[PDB]
Amino acid sequence: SIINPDWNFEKMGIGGLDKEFSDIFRRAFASRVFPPEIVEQMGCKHVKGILLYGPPGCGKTLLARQIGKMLNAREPKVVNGPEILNKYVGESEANIRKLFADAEEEQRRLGANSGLHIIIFDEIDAICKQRGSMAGSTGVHDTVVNQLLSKIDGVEQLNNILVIGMTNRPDLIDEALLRPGRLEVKMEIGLPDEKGRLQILHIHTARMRGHQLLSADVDIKELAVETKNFSGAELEGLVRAAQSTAMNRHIKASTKVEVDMEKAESLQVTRGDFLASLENDIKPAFGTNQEDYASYIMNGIIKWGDPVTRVLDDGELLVQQTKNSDRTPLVSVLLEGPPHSGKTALAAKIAEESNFPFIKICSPDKMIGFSETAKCQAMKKIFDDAYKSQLSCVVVDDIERLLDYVPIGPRFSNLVLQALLVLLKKAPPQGRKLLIIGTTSRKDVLQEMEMLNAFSTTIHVPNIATGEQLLEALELLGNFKDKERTTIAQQVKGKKVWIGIKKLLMLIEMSLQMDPEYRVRKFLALLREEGASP
Amino acid sequence: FEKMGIGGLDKEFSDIFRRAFASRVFPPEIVEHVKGILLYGPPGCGKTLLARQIGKMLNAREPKVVNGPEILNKYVGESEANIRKLFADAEEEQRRLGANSGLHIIIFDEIDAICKTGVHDTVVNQLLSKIDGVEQLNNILVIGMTNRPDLIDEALLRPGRLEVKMEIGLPDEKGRLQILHIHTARMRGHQLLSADVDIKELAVETKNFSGAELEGLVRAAQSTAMNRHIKASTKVEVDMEKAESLQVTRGDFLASLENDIKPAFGTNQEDYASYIMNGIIKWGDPVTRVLDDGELLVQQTKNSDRTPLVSVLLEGPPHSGKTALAAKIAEESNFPFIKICSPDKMIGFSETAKCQAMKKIFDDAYKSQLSCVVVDDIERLLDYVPIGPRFSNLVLQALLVLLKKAPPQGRKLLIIGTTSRKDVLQEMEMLNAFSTTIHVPNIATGEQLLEALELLGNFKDKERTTIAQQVKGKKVWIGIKKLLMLIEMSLQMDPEYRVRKFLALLREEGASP
Amino acid sequence: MAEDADMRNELEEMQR
Ligand SMILES: Nc1ncnc2c1ncn2[C@@H]1O[C@H](COP(=O)(O)OP(=O)(O)OP(=O)(O)O)[C@@H](O)[C@H]1O
Ligand SMILES: Nc1ncnc2c1ncn2[C@@H]1O[C@H](COP(=O)(O)OP(=O)(O)OP(=O)(O)O)[C@@H](O)[C@H]1O
Ligand SMILES: Nc1ncnc2c1ncn2[C@@H]1O[C@H](COP(=O)(O)OP(=O)(O)OP(=O)(O)O)[C@@H](O)[C@H]1O
Ligand SMILES: Nc1ncnc2c1ncn2[C@@H]1O[C@H](COP(=O)(O)OP(=O)(O)OP(=O)(O)O)[C@@H](O)[C@H]1O
């Protein structure tokens, strides 16, 4: 047979690639396994090439070497990068032909019943690039490409060779090589999912379990839940770092390296090591697509009164409508209120509570010093990314800062305004749904520009109005004792107040800098001085 | 010509047999020749098969083939010496047997590698001199194949050296049918192919495919059928008990077509259907009036001799359904050329880009015999803001000029513009440019609203009775798009609250003109 | 316009 009779999937050690390996076997190794008679009756030819590609550290080389191990054949030939190039003219092609000489001789000698020969190319893009589009200085590269093309499939027919190639940039490869007969099976390797992450971790923890060197408090399922966007190499590095942390307890240094011995026979790896390494040693190379919600919500949310709940309720309702509607695949809403009321935090909370696959926030904090064309390009890119998903949500905050508005004259950028109107009007591709949430603090200006009618609904976000709400907020914050609260109530309860929560936090922080006998008076003075408002 | 196993190139081979071997087969006395052929085309079209079968068909010596740049050598004088070893036998036969000499065939594979600096130019010069030099041969034929014909040296293509230039192209439906027959005959002969499979459907489906891709698709189908009798996970198996009985169903071919092979060419995207989503429902007389006016304008454009150009403007308030009716009129026009110009396709552009796009659309329109063009959201096209106000004058002037330029002699053009702000256009002095105008109104009375709700069929009788109690005795002012939005918002809550929420929203939106 | 900048070269050897 062509398969080493001592073989199994488990001993290979590949975690997350189940569909890909099955497809590879199905599409490349079915012909050589069945009885020759039926194959001859069908009169079909065998595959001669495979192309693996993907992002770094996903398992291409591991897959290739395991495949080489799986077969019973001659030892595979490996080409390590551009180790074929030479300075004397005509010597690269000789090196290339030396690779196929043995297979050609064996085929000529034995006919159709000869063995298989495997050749592996790594970093294939180094040697194989488009003949026409390259540095027009020396013709060595084009001749190398021509020789390879001729040798793989020439006038003389060679049919007992399999060629594997792996790369990181598939596009650069010349098209004439990626056609049926040379390399038709083109697989893609990508980042794993939760199940694949669990499989990889279980693969890499087995030997530690076998010899009773792993603590029972470790839970691999929780680890797989936590490690989001990690890859195989990172998942192995995390285990290596945890093992190093566990080992370092028994070594004493800073004058001479001593490794104990009495206590070196009772070593175990706990969960504290994993938790410590997750936060100090390893960071995912792929930038977290998850939004940094902690930045937008920095002090949580406290239910100081009724309106908060109401606002959230409205948002929930809107979400439901955009999830269970087909006549209106696009919905919009605008949050407006006085300054320092907490519109951005509420919008972020509403966006987060939903479970949509795609969620992004567009802010002016990133477009500093940008022209009015760069802003349009950025918005267009964000919306283009949004269109791909089946369910999308987008948040546009600080609209007045996105248009460069100043009341003197006034002045603003018109290109961004027109782009925003057009984007708000149009709908996504067929069978997809999009939700948009806008935030602003000046509604009359937007009304003048005639964009308030482009939205579908509006929600109002008021600030603290009565003294009872102020007392509730203070109780939730817990910055003052009961004795101080009695004094504060004795004055505030009589009348109404008009202040935002952010300003309230600022005032509290400013007040707490005085000596204990003066803090209440400072707070009252600040509230009376800055509180002149409706 | 299908015997050789290549389909879709019968005519090319007829040309070959005419232009190449007619002199050799024609009786010698009346004759009392051509020595160059170059085949080019995209990869996988059967050039190697052509060369091999050409070598086999003639009764001559075994052809000599050089595989790529084997001639190049590190030493001096070896690259040129390698070429002279190819023609030794031809010279010997020419000098000994004279005219009565056998034909010699030379095949050059990837000839662009050695023809196109001391080595390469000397090689090319030696080849040129040997093929056509002081001594003239009449019993040699040289064949070359290329995938990049634009990288070959010009001096090699002159008459007397490379005469017969040929192009291989992607086969048409009949050629693809021939190829599928060739690659499925072996399966059919042994009854290993299921009876449900139709070759004609496969031929119609496989658009833009080449021969190699078709053979790969067939191979993928075979592999899909074969894997059914293969076991993995623990060890590789052949089954045998069921493998002996292997049939290739249609599902295998369909699945192989979905993923394993792809055409590898581009795709076209259509947007017109997007402009009418919910259709047109007749809730009153005005829609019929608008459609009748559109038909009158279309007929006037069709049967006019000294008014080849006609323009119209559609007027109405927001959320009234103007673009949908314009698209409907354009569709009912039944003109060979129809297009829609929208600002959705131009986001972030400057004035010059918009002008160029509009000019390109109108240039395309001018080529046909009778054409129709619709422009919607004029105020968005020439971006307008009430503050200042501010707008783009270049686009305004371009539109003004284009609105009164007639097409070439004997051709017809219709233009339909839509807007929701007529006073602004009147101030710009563009309302005069158009020939006529039409008005698109809102829903005015409660009877029309009830008819529209009946057509939509969202509410049942019990709630319609209460709605009629509330609305029938009053005037209303609402669009249809906003009406659908309101209905969808109201439907969200539980069945108890729906009517009250709907009427609360209606009261919120109530207004008068 | 600006005139294309200066560029480096690669070299190839030959035996005899
Ligand atoms: N899916 C996986 N299952 C198990 N181990 C894995 C997996 N992916 C990666 N690894 C581990 O990570 C190591 C590094 O990965 P590998 O060498 O296969 O990456 P690669 O894709 O060939 O690299 P690159 O693209 O950076 O050149 C592997 O030797 C193996 O130890
Ligand atoms: N109940 C609450 N609702 C909203 N924000 C709250 C609440 N309790 C605390 N906060 C905090 O108050 C701040 C309000 O958010 P933020 O500073 O973005 O307000 P904003 O009104 O949008 O600001 P700006 O006036 O600068 O535009 C955030 O730190 C939020 O965490
Ligand atoms: N027109 C065709 N008719 C039949 N089989 C074809 C045809 N075109 C390609 N094939 C199939 O493709 C293979 C022949 O490819 P061939 O080597 O002749 O192509 P080519 O055009 O010379 O390629 P390249 O330019 O890539 O070297 C065989 O499998 C043959 O069955
Ligand atoms: N009789 C009708 N006339 C027009 N549109 C109708 C009619 N019945 C249903 N519709 C639907 O109503 C919607 C009309 O919206 P449309 O985009 O045409 O409005 P518009 O007035 O151009 O919009 P806006 O002024 O907001 O840009 C489309 O979904 C159309 O299918």
A344 is catalytic: yes
The Cα-based distances of A82 to A123, A144, B137, B210, B442 in angstroms read: 8, 11, 45, 33, 73
- To 10 degrees, the CA torsion angle through B98, B101, B107, B112? 20
| H or E element at residue B309 | strand B309-315
CB atoms within 10 A of CB A156: 12
Q: In which residue are the tokens 């056509």 written?
A: B132
Cβ-contact B230, A30 below 8 angstroms: yes
Count of residues for chain A?
534
What is the C-alpha separation between A54 and A449, in angstroms, rounded? 48
- The amino acid at residue B494 is D
Phi, psi of A71 (to 5 degrees): -90, 150
3-state secondary structure of A174: coil
Evaluated on CA atoms A251, A252, A258, A264, the torsion sign reads negative
Query: Choosing from A77, A398, A443, A458, which is the catalytic residue?
Result: A398
Count of residues for chain B?
513
What is the C-alpha separation between B254 and A91, in angstroms, rounded? 47
Helices B211-227 and A19-29 pack at an angle, to 10 degrees, of 110
Experimentally, the structure was elucidated by cryo-EM
CB atoms within 10 A of CB A462: 14
Cβ-contact B437, B315 below 8 angstroms: yes
Going by C-alpha positions, the residue among B142, B58, B132 that lies closest to residue B102 is: B58
Tell me the β-bridge partners of B416. Answer: B312, B374
What is the C-alpha separation between B30 and B24, in angstroms, rounded? 11
Task: Indicate which residues of B carry an active-site annotation.
Answer: 322-323, 376-377, 404, 481
- The amino acid at residue A210 is G
Minimum-distance CB partner of B69 among A8, A146, A418 = A146
Count CA atoms within 13 Å of residue A449 on its CB side.
25
The Cα-based distances of B42 to A153, A356, B148 in angstroms read: 15, 46, 8
Cis? peptide before B389, omega within 30° of 0: yes
Q: Say yes or no: A137 contacts chain C, CB-CB below 8 A.
A: yes
- The amino acid at residue B300 is Q
First to last CA, chain C: 46
Closest-CA distance of chain C to residue B69, Å: 17
User: E-strand spans in A380-498?
Assistant: 391-396, 433-440, 457-460
Tell me the β-bridge partners of A332. Answer: A436
Cβ-contact A512, A519 below 8 angstroms: yes
Q: Say yes or no: C13 contacts chain A, CB-CB below 8 A.
A: yes
Residue A117 tokens read as 């020969």
Minimum-distance CB partner of A176 among B147, B233, B260 = B147
Cβ-contact A214, A246 below 8 angstroms: no
- The amino acid at residue A242 is A
Cβ-contact B438, B314 below 8 angstroms: yes
Q: Say yes or no: A45 contacts chain B, CB-CB below 8 A.
A: yes
Chain A residues with CB-CB distance to C14 below 8 A: 88-89
Contacts of residues A294-300 at CB distance under 8 Å and 24 or more positions apart, as own/partner, are A296/A344, A296/A345, A296/A348, A296/A361, A297/A345, A297/A348, A297/A349, A299/A505
A205 is catalytic: no
Sheet holding A391-396: strands in order across? Answer: A358-362, A391-396, A433-440, A330-336, A457-460
Chain B residues with CB-CB distance to A175 below 8 A: 43
What is the C-alpha separation between A218 and A286, in angstroms, rounded? 26
Looking at chain B from residue 231 to 260, which residues have their Cβ under 8 Å from any Cβ of chain A?
A: 232-236, 238, 240, 243-244, 246, 260
What is the C-alpha separation between B375 and B402, in angstroms, rounded? 12
Cis? peptide before B63, omega within 30° of 0: no
- The amino acid at residue B24 is R
What is the C-alpha separation between B229 and B222, in angstroms, rounded? 12
Residue B513 tokens read as 């003109």
Angle made by CA atoms B352, B355, B357, in degrees to the nearest 5: 110
Evaluated on CA atoms B122, B127, B129, B135, the torsion sign reads positive
Give the residues surrounding ligand 2 with Cβ less than 6 Å away: A 297-302, 304, 308, 339-346, 441, 501-502
3-state secondary structure of A98: helix
Phi-psi region of A81 (alpha: psi -120 to 50; beta: other; left: phi over 0): left
Contacts of residues B153-158 at CB distance under 8 Å and 24 or more positions apart, as own/partner, are B153/B115, B153/B116, B153/B124, B155/B124, B155/B128, B156/B115, B156/B124, B156/B127, B156/B128, B157/B38
| H or E element at residue A475 | helix A467-477
Residues 6+ apart with CB under 8 A from A348: A291, A293, A296, A297, A361, A395
Ligand 1 pocket: which of A62, A122, A164 to mutate (most atoms within 8 A of CB)? A62
Q: In which residue are the tokens 């940039």 written?
A: A169
Cβ contact C13–A87 (<8 Å): yes
What is the C-alpha separation between A124 and A49, in angstroms, rounded? 13
What is the C-alpha separation between B95 and B89, in angstroms, rounded? 10
Q: Say yes or no: C9 contacts chain A, CB-CB below 8 A.
A: yes
Query: Choosing from A60, A245, A397, A503, which is the catalytic residue?
Result: A397
Looking at chain A from residue 46 to 85, which residues have their Cβ under 8 Å from any Cβ of chain B?
A: 47
**What b/e string do you get for A197-220 counting C-beta neighbours within 10 Å, with b at 16 or more?**
bbbbbebbbeebeeeeebeeebee
Phi, psi of B339 (to 5 degrees): -150, 160
Count CA atoms within 13 Å of residue B177 on its CB side.
8
Going by C-alpha positions, the residue among B218, B212, B266, B265 that lies closest to residue B43 is: B212
CB atoms within 10 A of CB A239: 19
- The amino acid at residue A394 is V
Q: Say yes or no: C8 contacts chain A, CB-CB below 8 A.
A: no
Ligand 1 pocket: which of A18, A53, A58, A207 to mutate (most atoms within 8 A of CB)? A58
Ligand 4 within 6 A of CB of B170: no
- The amino acid at residue A385 is D
- The amino acid at residue B456 is L
Residues 6+ apart with CB under 8 A from A185: A24, A27, A28, A47, A49, A50, A51
Going by C-alpha positions, the residue among B508, B342, B129 that lies closest to residue A427 is: B342
Ligand 4 pocket: which of B481, B484, B485, B487 to mutate (most atoms within 8 A of CB)? B481
Q: In which residue are the tokens 């935030």 written?
A: A439
3-state secondary structure of A168: coil
Going by C-alpha positions, the residue among A340, A433, A421 that lies closest to residue A393 is: A433
Angle made by CA atoms B30, B33, B36, in degrees to the nearest 5: 160
| Nearest chain C alpha carbon to B77 | C16
What is the C-alpha separation between A122 and B487, in angstroms, rounded? 61
Going by C-alpha positions, the residue among B190, B196, B210 that lies closest to residue B254 is: B196
The Cα-based distances of A132 to A324, B165, C4 in angstroms read: 53, 22, 22
- Best of C7, C10, C12, C14 to substitute, by most chain A Cβ atoms within 10 angstroms, is C12
Ligand 4 within 6 A of CB of B448: no
Q: In which residue are the tokens 């090196």 written?
A: A95
The Cα-based distances of A185 to B19, B216, B224 in angstroms read: 41, 10, 14
Strands B164-167 and B309-315: what pairing?
Answer: unpaired
Phi, psi of A437 (to 5 degrees): -125, 125
| Nearest chain C alpha carbon to B118 | C14
What is the C-alpha separation between B16 and B6, in angstroms, rounded? 15
What is the C-alpha separation between B161 and B2, in angstroms, rounded? 31
- The amino acid at residue A280 is N
**CA B325 to chain centroid:** 29
Q: Say yes or no: A140 contacts chain C, CB-CB below 8 A.
A: yes
Cβ-contact B217, B256 below 8 angstroms: yes
Chain B residues with CB-CB distance to A25 below 8 A: 232
Ligand 4 within 6 A of CB of B176: no
A397 is catalytic: yes
A503 is catalytic: no
Resolution in Å equals: 3.0
Cβ contact A88–C9 (<8 Å): no
What is the C-alpha separation between A106 and A287, in angstroms, rounded? 51
Strands B475-478 and A185-188: what pairing?
Answer: unpaired
Phi-psi region of A250 (alpha: psi -120 to 50; beta: other; left: phi over 0): alpha
Cβ contact A137–C10 (<8 Å): yes
CB atoms within 10 A of CB A173: 19
What is the C-alpha separation between B372 and B383, in angstroms, rounded? 24
Tell me the β-bridge partners of A258. Answer: A252
Phi, psi of C5 (to 5 degrees): -70, 175
The Cα-based distances of B430 to B388, B398, B400, B402 in angstroms read: 20, 12, 7, 12
Query: B43 C-alpha vs ligand 3 centroid, how far in Å?
Result: 8
CB atoms within 10 A of CB B379: 16
